[model samples]
Target: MQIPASEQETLVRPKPLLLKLLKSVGAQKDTYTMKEVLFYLGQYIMTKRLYDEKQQHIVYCSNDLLGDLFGVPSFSVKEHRKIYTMIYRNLVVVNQQ
Candidate 1:
């Protein structure tokens, strides 16, 4: 069966990075939601020169955004962010190239 071009790209592209990162910590892929995937990709590196209005793209500085996304101190930390990044690299950025 032939997949549509956009569908093919979307479905196939990130698994390579996914495999490399997710395996490091014994993470399971299905345990994550698409919202989670998109969140990590966006937060992998928050942008200053882009997406001024996007909710996921404003993750700048030390405490405000990161803390909000990953949580603040005693409650959570970079562990989640790092795990997410292992599943990271930008799908949007990759597609641009």
Candidate 2:
């Protein structure tokens, strides 16, 4: 069966700069739905245990990648809930042409 055009439109590919970090998060897909990318990224953040010990709702920048992603030493988890927006910025719509 073929994927619907509407569904295909939801597919996107990550930008070159995000490739390394995405790979580190174990994303091997050439293309992905935005939801999938967000899922993987969220999983990565959780798995890395980057949350502040005193305040679990805060994401503590534990490495260069996290620092760059958040652009701060730490950001509220409430804020990262919109992290998909950040991830979206690193993705390009697939097959736009």
Candidate 3:
């Protein structure tokens, strides 16, 4: 699904810090494709659970709604936490501006 331009701009605008963090952690390579990024973002919002918290639920409800949408084994707890933390932090920054 295509995210609204307003949401995309809001999401990307504050992500320089996050990109720097990711690069520092040696994640410069595009392991996560654009589609994956968008999908995870949507999932994060829809679930209302922070990333780490969502892992267990996602795993438990393997055959349910989120599973089908996100695919099985969506993300590890560490990855989920990091992504959500970055997104949450960035969003806060965006709102402040």
Q: All candidates: CA RMSD in angstroms?
A: 12.9, 6.1, 11.8
User: In model 1, what are the clashing residue pairs, if there are any?
Assistant: 85-88
Model 3 ranges with Cα > 4 A deviation: 11-21, 24-72, 75-91
User: TM-scores of all models?
Assistant: 0.24, 0.67, 0.24
Q: Sort the predicted structures by TM-score, highest score first.
A: 2, 3, 1
| Residue pairs in candidate 3 whose N, alpha carbon or C atoms collide under 3 angstroms | none
Candidate 3 positional error at 81, Å: 17
The lDDT of model 2 is: 0.68
What are the lDDT figures for the candidates, one per model?
A: 0.39, 0.68, 0.41
Model 2: residues with Cα > 4 Å off, grouped in runs:
1-9, 95-97
Q: 10-89, model 3: which lDDT tens digit per residue?
A: 32332554344334433453334333344554554345443445346333325444343334434443355444443454
Candidates 1 and 3 compared by lDDT, better number: 3
Task: Sort all candidates by lDDT, best to worst.
Answer: 2, 3, 1
Off by over 4 Å in 1: 1-14, 18-31, 47-97
lDDT digits (tens) for residues 1-97 of candidate 1: 2324443234323454453333344444533444545454444433322233445533333443333333422221234445344333423323344
- Candidate 3: worst-modelled 10 consecutive residues by lDDT: 86-95
